[PDB]
């Protein structure tokens, strides 16, 4: 019966909440208070990357920690040489409303997507001197909000319709589909072993997915509004979410709970980009208040601020060796920090 | 200092910057428009007529080019997006204007249209963006009022005390009852607009039909007014 099914679902949710409460004996802050604080963090702008016409929605670091791809609403992907601020490539797009971009771990391809509902993949290393579209992936009904490369042939995309999809690139057909969300899916983050990934949606819930199995292993419901950004701790057993309720949150897959919330009374704007450091001690979060903040992931106190942008920060990414942090905003400027 | 290959790389970057400068010249000279409306609202007919007169299975956006007096316009309407709008609407906060096409001859889904227009107007990212609303299907409205089969006072009781504004200007000249009804609808929309306008953005009403060929001219004039007020704000004139 439908009523019996609803009652069973409610009872099982209550049991899950009770189990989560029982498994929690001491909060992360109460245990971590006995570690010396990192103190004030002094980070300054080293380079500024001019050239994007319009506001920037997307940015992804290279695996070589020197190349950088950026996507802006004017309809361009620019590959910057971060050390010299030179432009390596200028990729014009068919759809100007691009609001996600990824850089392949090998460095041979870049992906992008947006309101066109298509995830386009470009071949950086061709026999010709130009960059050309490798393949265009179709099948999502809503706008594509995030894309991440597993390898040179597998990509994972999240879309406006309540569905994530795993794609084969050689054959345009979707290898696997991920359903279960009830709102727009906004952000996505692959595991260090590229076996699991999370999706943050507009249902204020984050789901831990299984790439091969194709099923939602876990669900995290702690936020009060839609989730805008999400990323794993470098350990690979935890992730952090930034939402419109002006609070960041750290979830743990193994505990299947919420560890800390990074919130302040003065901040009221919602976070739009989240990224950790290499040790995971710094949680850098972009905000709508024109400035990016730096949080201590172990004490939940705001260690520093990266404030140099003339409009809200949309994208944020920390390089693989941890030597720098790139920050992109709607003022059409990328800033390299150290 | 730096090697000869680095000179050649810097020259390549300079060439890329030259291409970006030409692209900037093209980009700055074009005004972007976001088309909005319900299914019954004849925005599809409007965009088809504009495409005919002036200038893919699950695609999420439809792009339309039209040019009036050597001024470029791109008008975008979303095709495959869900009923939710609060997320992908943030991409359209730098457009010149939002064209909200509304059906005024329905009398049943019109309150839903007012709610949608109120949500668009009060959006935190859609501020300082002037909205051009097209009160579409005027001939259907006149026919339905003259027929008398359906009335408006039942859906909106405030119509009973409503009287025709002194500024009403029916150009062709017809029954004052249809003029009173259409100006009542327009005044409801303008009341929603002026409730929280705060002077940051304006609202441009138009009694139009999807068959009308003057819609492009109306959009051009409204966009010229919007750009004029933006330039007056930018050039420290007010």
């Amino acid at each position: 019966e439908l009523d019996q099914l609803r009652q069973e679902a409610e009872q099982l949710k209550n049991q899950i909440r009770d189990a989560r409460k029982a498994c929690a004996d001491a909060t992360l802050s109460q245990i971590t208070n006995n570690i010396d604080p990192v103190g004030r963090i002094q980070m300054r702008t080293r380079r500024t990357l001019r050239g994007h016409l319009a506001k920037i929605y997307a940015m992804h670091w290279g695996t070589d920690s020197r190349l950088l791809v950026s996507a802006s609403q004017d309809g361009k992907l620019i590959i910057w040489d971060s050390y010299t601020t030179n432009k390596v490539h200028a990729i014009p797009l068919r759809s100007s409303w691009v609001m996600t971009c990824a850089y392949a771990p090998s460095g041979n391809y870049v992906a992008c997507g947006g309101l066109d509902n298509i995830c386009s993949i470009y071949n950086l290393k061709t026999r010709e001197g130009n960059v050309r579209v490798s393949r265009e992936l179709a099948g999502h009904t809503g706008y594509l909000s995030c894309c991440r490369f597993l390898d040179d042939n597998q990509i994972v995309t999240s879309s406006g319709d309540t569905t994530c999809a795993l794609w084969d690139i050689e054959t345009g057909q979707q290898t696997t589909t991920f359903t279960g969300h009830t709102g727009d899916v906004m952000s996505l983050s692959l595991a260090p072993d590229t076996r699991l990934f999370v999706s943050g949606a507009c249902d204020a819930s984050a789901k831990l997915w299984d790439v091969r199995e194709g099923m939602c292993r876990q669900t995290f419901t702690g936020h009060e509004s839609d989730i805008n950004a999400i990323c794993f701790f470098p350990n690979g057993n935890a992730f952090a979410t930034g939402s419109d309720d002006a609070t960041c949150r750290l979830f743990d897959l193994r505990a299947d709970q919420e560890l800390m919330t990074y919130s302040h009374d003065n901040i009221i704007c919602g976070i739009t980009s989240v990224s950790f450091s290499k040790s995971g001690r710094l949680l850098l979060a972009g905000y709508d208040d024109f400035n990016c903040n730096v949080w201590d992931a172990l004490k939940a106190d705001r260690a520093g601020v990266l404030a140099g942008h003339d409009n809200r920060v949309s994208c944020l990414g920390v390089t693989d060796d941890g030597m720098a942090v790139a920050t992109g905003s709607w003022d059409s400027f990328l800033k390299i920090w150290n | 200092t730096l090697s000869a290959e680095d000179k050649a790389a810097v020259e390549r970057s300079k060439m890329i910057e030259k291409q970006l400068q030409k692209d900037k010249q093209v980009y700055r000279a074009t005004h972007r428009l976001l088309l909005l409306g319900a299914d019954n609202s004849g925005k599809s007919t409007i965009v088809k007529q504009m495409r005919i007169y002036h200038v893919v299975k699950t695609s999420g956006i439809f792009e339309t080019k039209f040019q009036v007096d050597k001024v470029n316009f791109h008008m975008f309407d979303v095709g495959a997006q869900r009923d939710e709008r609060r997320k992908w609407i943030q991409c359209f906060n730098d457009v010149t204007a939002i064209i909200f096409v509304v059906d005024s001859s329905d009398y049943n889904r019109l309150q839903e249209a007012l709610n949608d227009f109120k949500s668009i107007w009060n959006n935190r990212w859609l501020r300082t963006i002037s909205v051009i609303l097209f009160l579409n299907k005027q001939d259907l409205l006149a026919e339905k009022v003259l027929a008398g089969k359906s009335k408006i006072e039942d859906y909106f009781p405030e119509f009973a005390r409503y009287t025709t504004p002194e500024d009403a200007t029916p150009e062709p000249g017809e029954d004052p009852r249809v003029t009173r009804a259409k100006y009542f609808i327009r005044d409801e929309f303008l009341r929603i607009s002026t409730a929280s306008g705060d002077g940051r953005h304006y609202c441009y009403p138009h009694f139009t039909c999807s068959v009308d060929t003057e819609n492009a001219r109306r959009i051009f004039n409204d966009c010229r007014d919007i750009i004029q007020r933006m330039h007056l704000r930018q050039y420290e004139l007010l």
Partner: single-chain antibody
Amino acid sequence: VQLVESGGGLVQPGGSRKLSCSASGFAFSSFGMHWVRQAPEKGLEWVAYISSGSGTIYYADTVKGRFTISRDDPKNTLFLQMTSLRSEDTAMYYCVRSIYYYGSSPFDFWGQGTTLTVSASADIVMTQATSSVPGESVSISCRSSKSLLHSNGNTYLYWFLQRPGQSPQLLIYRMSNLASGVPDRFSGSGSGTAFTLTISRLEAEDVGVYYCMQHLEYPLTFGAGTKLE
């Protein structure tokens, strides 16, 4: 991708001739191009270089005023205009393609070449070993007058393998990076002044002449090279 060049013939001394290089199959405008010649019995010698967009044109010290180089991007062709053709110009002029960005591989493709016959300073001199050296391993070595290591960290050392037949094809750029299409057997080594190219398993197709090249500063000196038989 391909580079076809023509315009080679017997020329009386003191005359003028124009070499053309027709390119097809790649983005011509994004590639800077070079002219590299070899005498019939000598090694390769760099001639000229024109950059992408014609913003940077270089010439060798021996060809500084006699030759001029120009490109036609709409026509997708490259020209070399020759003036005052002396007797020391009888060589095999090659048309070379090169691009420059972070991680690019310059000199990656070469044309077929043209044969020209004429009737009767403080630069990094690159010196090779003796030009006389299946299944074995060979360790062709080279030496540089000046250190090729730059403050950037890239040592601009290039390896070219010319078969007894067709034109040279790039093997290793910047002493460590195997070019596209080259088998994994080839490897490059060095320390800043002396460099060694190693083939881990000789084959029948590895026979030919190995030329080295430097790109730290113009002119692009090559060296005599070594022969494998």
